[PDB]
Amino acid sequence: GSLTEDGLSYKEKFVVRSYEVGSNKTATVETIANLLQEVGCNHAQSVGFSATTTTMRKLHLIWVTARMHIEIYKYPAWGDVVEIETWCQSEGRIGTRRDWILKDSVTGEVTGRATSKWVMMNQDTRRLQKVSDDVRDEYLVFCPQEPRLAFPEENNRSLKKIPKLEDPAQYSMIGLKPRRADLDMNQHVNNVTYIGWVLESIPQEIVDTHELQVITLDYRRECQQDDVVDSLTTTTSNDSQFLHLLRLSGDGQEINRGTTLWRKK
């Protein structure tokens, strides 16, 4: 992987592995979600990070994901190479936004794209806060100054409001517990695990006859190792839409909400 000529975006090529593919011999949405987070880690390392500034570490502040939107047109096949370009942008005092562009390494065609809204949170008290000026000055030198959106569209699905699933849910997957493989290098449940848990309540028939095109996922609270999650789904609709909800089985506290769009094969 490497920074582009301007040093304002990062590119990386990944070869799809045997354990990264599903029933139709192509990369899963969780494998794609993993590749997006791996290229973000290398973009931070290349521009001089370990992605918190000296001021952020001093004040015990971290960047957390508030929304993850992923749209796929073609999933890379096992053995195929996929090139991912990522970049961050300042969204004023609200926070930052990280975008991605997935391309076929042979044809150069855009086979997918993603966007995410990141917020600033105190690592210790969990209290969110608007980006201060001194923090913004340290990041701006690594972001393009003119707007560069992966989802520019006049009426895009990345900025759509997600409602709360009303009970009873049409489908459900109960008693979901994270294992050590679901933890990251800091012993926290990986954000990609929530993607898997959301798709657990989608009926197997829908999976076997449809392909996942869009997935918007709003993050509300982190799930601890000793917590048990419930996955709820309802069909809100060749295209099929679903409303999703992840809540603690022990009290119904909401940890996640989302939508998925699927198309016929």
Catalytic residue among 88, 223, 244, 256: 223
Can you tell me which of 114, 120, 135, 176 binds a second copy, judged by CB under 8 A? 176
Largest Cα–Cα distance in the chain?
A: 53
Phi and psi at residue 191, to the nearest 5°: -65, -20
47 counts as binding ligand HWH under rule CB under 6 A = yes
Nearer to a second copy, 25 or 160 (CB): 25
Q: How far is the CB of 39 from ligand HWH (least distance, A)?
A: 10
**Partners of 99 in the beta sheet?**
87, 115
Residues in region 141-200 near ligand HWH by CB under 6 A: 142-143
Q: How far is the CB of 205 from a second copy (least distance, A)?
A: 14
To ligand HWH, the closest distance from the beta carbon of 62 in angstroms equals 9
For ligand HWH, the closer CB: 144 or 173? 144
Catalytic residue check, 188: yes
Nearer to ligand HWH, 118 or 219 (CB): 118
Active site residue 41: no
What are the φ/ψ torsions at residue 236 (nearest 5 degrees)? -90, 10
Site for a second copy in 57-96 (CB under 8 A): 78
- Minimum gap (Å) between residue 262 Cβ and ligand HWH: 28
Minimum CB distance to a second copy smaller for 158 or for 201: 201
Cβ pair 216, 69 in contact under 8 A: yes
Q: Does 238 bind a second copy (CB under 8 A)?
A: no
User: Which positions touch ligand HWH (CB under 6 A)?
Assistant: 40, 43-44, 47, 49, 51, 63, 88, 96, 98, 118, 139, 142-143
Q: Which residues are designated catalytic? A: 186, 188, 223
